[model samples]
Target: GSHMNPPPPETSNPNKPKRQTNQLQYLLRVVLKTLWKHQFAWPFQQPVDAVKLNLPDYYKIIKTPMDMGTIKKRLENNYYWNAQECIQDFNTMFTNCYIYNKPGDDIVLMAEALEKLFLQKINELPTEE
Candidate 1:
């Protein structure tokens, strides 16, 4: 009677807990989807190809390379703790583009458009309880 069966695993979180991601996560995803569908989002959808684009100084100038794909993965994986952190990545993505491109460049204009749209959508999100 001492042992009825083998002891269970001693892991703290043995089974992957299905935590409910906050409402902000869903709202942010919608905002991001809007941006991804926009025409100006082409340039920011994927990571910049420094070598392919022949921008040898790309890595030198931009330390952090943020992109839509990266952001989406982080969001889906629940890597972001709050909406603030998620929005910061978007800011970084556009800022990095501005740093490497001329103000008059077409890509710069695209980034500006996408940034405007993102801000508008993000601002519309309701405060989480």
Candidate 2:
């Protein structure tokens, strides 16, 4: 009797895996966990009374209109030394995100509230001059 040779291992690109379920689930879990950790405080900081969504929602809501250069400049100039302070600034940015959404009472109210909150925050930072 002749022994059959073993089959060759299947080859594919690692960066482009055919099965993305595990990768997607892992990403979702990470995002959801961060949302759970941070979203509780979101409502307290906002004028709203509810924290229904998570961090990614917040990111989606306001990422387009933010002045990343200004924030980066502030961070570089002031030298944010702690995570709490970093979070505070991030929260301030989140607050301002309300203004960019489609018009509604909630959006208007939150935008106004965030303006006041962000102004106060800006005052706390050093001027680039």
Candidate 3:
């Protein structure tokens, strides 16, 4: 009879798993970056000052913790012109941004603000145009 070989040592730890990125988180980060950069039509005289002024809005949105599902539903239900394109554009931005940065709880708020701003701008445009 042959003696059993000693069990091989465990090389990998099972308790902790690597974090995976997903669409939602990516979208949030994109929206946040977009808001930070483009919220105002006119470019700030100084980029740093602009960021400082807009920083509060970012924090405010973070505190609100918006729901992505609800915002999506609202956007879908609305009959605004070019709705699909708008949604797709936002999705694309989110995807692009997610590649570089990970979003936190505040993503919800950032998304909501972007959605609201889009709706408002579209509404301001005359229907005939």
Candidate 4:
């Protein structure tokens, strides 16, 4: 004897997964809290330091969404003076703002080098008349 249950109904509408609001809110809160903790420290208390974050430039990079490889190459080749200007510009934009970034060694290295170059240039400026 063969017995078969009725086949499930097929609807024209595509089936979509439903998200639970409470679960999603909890997850979002955790993520925001982690970012706040990492980004708000004075010298940056995350795995990476403040100089390694390059917050303003990174925001410009995201907004521009141009070629980052090319930008990184340009940064590596930038004159010390240009790096100083970059630091000043970023300070004007981000000194009062919070920042966070996921970690990567190349990014950390570039940021630290740029920070050093900025400091060197600023130190070279002659005292006012």
Best by lDDT: 1
Clashes of each: 0, 0, 0, 0
In candidate 2, what are the lDDT values of residues 37-84, reduced to their tens digit? 442334333222123342335444443322223334333344343334
lDDT of 3 by residue, 1-129 (tens): 112222221223445332313332323344323444554412211111214344434322332222233234323333123434334544543443333235643544454455566455444433322
The 10-residue segment with the lowest total lDDT in model 2: 1-10
C-alpha displacement of 12 in model 3, angstroms?
46
- Compared to the true structure, candidate 1 yields what TM-score? 0.79
Residue 102 of model 3 has an lDDT of 54
Give candidate 4 misplaced runs (Cα > 4 Å): 1-87, 92-98
Top TM-score hit: 1
* Candidate 4, residue 78: how far the Cα is off, in Å: 20
| lDDT values, one for every candidate | 0.73, 0.38, 0.35, 0.32
Global Cα lDDT for candidate 1: 0.73
Following a full C-alpha superposition, what root-mean-square deviation does model 2 have from the true structure? 18.5
For candidate 4, the 10 contiguous residues with the lowest summed lDDT are: 1-10
Query: Model 4 over residues 24-106: C-alpha lDDT tens digits?
Result: 23222432223223322223211222234434344433332212222222233331233333334334323222233344444
Report clash pairs, candidate 4: none
- Compute each candidate's TM-score over C-alphas: 0.79, 0.26, 0.25, 0.26
